[PDB]
Amino acid sequence: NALVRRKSGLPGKLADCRSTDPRKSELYVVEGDSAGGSAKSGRDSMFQAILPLRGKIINVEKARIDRVLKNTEVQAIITALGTGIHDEFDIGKLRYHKIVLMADADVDGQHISTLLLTLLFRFMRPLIENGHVFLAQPPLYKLKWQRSDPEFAYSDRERDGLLEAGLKAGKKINKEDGIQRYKGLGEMDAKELWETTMDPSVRVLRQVTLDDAAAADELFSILMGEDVDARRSFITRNAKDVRFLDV
């Protein structure tokens, strides 16, 4: 199985890869034009393609199907993945065996993730079941040591850890430039994105798994559905314990 990549019938925003093998190909679904631009530059153009998404994705749970199919961003995703939707879904025509969702570490990136995951679960569920969907974890900090190579941190804890270790090791940091804190993918350059989210030898990916389909169906409908009351009560009920889901 092999499929042609665009080079001078696919989305205009798509920066496709060169490899014609889906098994080896990857699609990075990116939040924002800036981040997508940097990703297009820092990627490995052989196996990695970039599809920047602009603005909040349409909620396929709330909006009727005809309106969803008219949405330019949804069309781009469906077209880029190559597979159909719902009953016309054919995994054989999947153009990328790795679909990496890359959003900002901030709160709005989390929201876009849920909107994208909702699109996938409702229109192209088998992509989730067969583990073709991943979540890229962007860096939060960049430690710029005076003499040593810079280190990236993906949490406040890791920042504190790498800071302590380096200082203990006799390294030093400026208290001015110091630790750069990322507030979004758009603030990163090509190199930074490669060395934290796209280089397969250092990137931190999370594979989206689907255990209970019925339970998932209910949760999607509650959180993303038209019923506000259900969503309100669910949030007030479970937000109190969001910290303790993995304890």
Binding site: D211, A216, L223
Partner: protein
């Protein structure tokens, strides 16, 4: 590669979104009635010195300062938020003094960032009054480089005054604006009757706050919806514009609309009537002409046919257009980091509590500072009494460290105080200058006693809020705009 279940991811991510939107974006803090973007814009302008005592700064500078230090978001929407706070038809009491084209109540958009200038209004200066005296908790900004205020002093009830509208997740708020003088009376009562229960307090406050006071004037019809909002936190308030029937030389009649209800777009309103007359659902209307201008204000002339009754057409307009429209009140605000629907007495009380907190904290700040000044002054006075020895000591010292260590031993003084003696100028050794130090000590000790007295007396604390608020209202309070009528 780590595995993660879709349910865990969805739940965690969406809750994180909902909560921050609820608490940190779409909904107002009950104490100052501000959303984060509002608070950050105002403080940015404040810290930048963009105040009414200086000329308008380019609004781009306010946006950029807000972006770079406090609000990690886009310049575009931040400008929109700044612009809104400058529109007299949006805010009942504008917090931004805009210079240039800030749009109109119609479809005329505001000018771009490059064209406009902006500074804080005098009332916005009361929002930030004495913010630098530890009157409110500060926290580090989004990257820890600088501090930002968690809440503003808000020396007038801004939430109730300017209202607030916001769409969050799972909930939304829609608080109407109110007349400052009426709110003040409510606060004055709350201060006097500080022990009154909620039942009594609600009755009193509802008597003084007659209802919302919209910047667009207009009319409020009925009293139930207003009462519902204040008692329940939800109510439907019927609004109306103002219509004045005019007769012509020929003897033709025309309806002149000079006011519209809150948040009704003038252009959309005219267009709606125009579209409702072609298809033909508002017969009796002969012609629609917008005779509005910057000099006469809103003036929509509706010429009606000879075989048409004025009130019939007006009633049809009330029915089929936003000439009559309801304000869906929902008194939702963030209280102690939690979203809560509040009664009117709760809104007043929580604000009064905030004011008392501000005044006590200000007093504490001033008291601490007064003691520090007094402490150093006491040191200087000791030096003056033994000035001959002090100077001789400093001179005979090989360094300033030898001189300092000696001064402590000489006069039995702290290191901070001894430091002050060293920092003393030869100016302060003049006769009259020596005297001012003495008197200043006497002056401050009186101030310290006063400040201590305030902290010890809840009566004075309440009195200060009353007197200071009264001063603000006398200066910045205005007449009611929205007229309240019965059914």
């Amino acid at each position: 590669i780590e595995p993660v279940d879709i349910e865990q991811e969805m739940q965690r991510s969406y809750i994180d979104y909902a909560m921050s939107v609820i608490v940190g974006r779409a909904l107002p803090e009950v104490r100052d009635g501000l959303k984060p973007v509002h608070r950050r814009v105002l403080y940015a302008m404040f810290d930048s010195g963009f105040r009414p005592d200086r000329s308008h700064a380019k609004s781009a500078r306010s946006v950029a300062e807000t972006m770079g230090n406090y609000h990690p978001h886009g310049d575009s929407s931040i400008y929109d938020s700044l612009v809104r706070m400058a529109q007299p038809w949006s805010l009942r009491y504008p917090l931004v003094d805009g210079q240039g084209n800030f749009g109109s109540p119609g479809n005329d958009p505001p000018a771009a960032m490059r064209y406009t200038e902006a500074r804080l209004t005098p009332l916005a200066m009361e929002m930030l009054r004495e913010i630098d005296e530890e009157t409110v908790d500060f926290i580090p900004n989004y990257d820890g480089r600088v501090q930002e205020p968690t809440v503003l002093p808000s020396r007038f009830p801004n939430l109730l005054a300017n209202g607030s509208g916001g769409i969050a997740v799972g909930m939304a708020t829609n608080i109407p604006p109110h007349n400052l003088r009426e709110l003040a009376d409510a606060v004055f009562w709350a201060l006097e009757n500080h022990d009154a229960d909620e039942e009594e307090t609600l009755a009193a406050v509802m008597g003084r706050v007659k209802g919302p006071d919209f910047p667009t004037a207009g009319l409020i019809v009925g009293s139930q919806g207003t009462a519902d909002a204040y008692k329940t936190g939800r109510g439907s308030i019927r609004m109306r514009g103002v219509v004045e029937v005019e007769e012509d030389s020929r003897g033709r009649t025309s309806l002149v609309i000079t006011e519209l209800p809150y948040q009704v777009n003038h252009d959309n309103f005219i267009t709606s009537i125009a579209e409702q007359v072609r298809d033909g659902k508002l017969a009796g209307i002969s012609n629609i002409e917008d005779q509005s201008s910057d000099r006469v204000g809103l003036r929509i002339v509706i010429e009606i046919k000879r075989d048409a009754v004025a009130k019939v057409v007006i009633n049809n307009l009330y029915k089929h257009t936003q000439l009559q429209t309801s304000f869906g009140a929902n008194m939702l605000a963030i209280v102690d980091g939690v979203p809560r629907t509040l009664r009117l007495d709760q809104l007043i009380r929580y604000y009064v509590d905030h004011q008392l907190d501000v005044i006590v904290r200000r007093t504490t700040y001033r008291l601490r500072k007064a003691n520090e000044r007094a402490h150093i002054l006491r040191g200087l006075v000791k030096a003056l009494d033994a000035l001959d020895e002090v100077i001789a000591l400093i001179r005979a010292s090989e360094t300033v460290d030898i001189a300092r260590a000696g001064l402590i031993e000489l006069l039995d003084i702290d290191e901070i105080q001894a430091q002050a003696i060293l920092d003393m100028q030869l100016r302060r050794l003049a006769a009259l200058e020596r005297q001012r130090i003495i008197d200043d000590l006497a002056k401050i000790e009186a101030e310290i006693a006063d400040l201590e007295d305030i902290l010890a007396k809840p009566e004075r604390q309440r009195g200060i809020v009353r007197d200071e608020l009264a001063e603000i209202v006398d200066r910045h309070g205005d007449d009611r705009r929205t007229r309240i009528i019965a059914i």
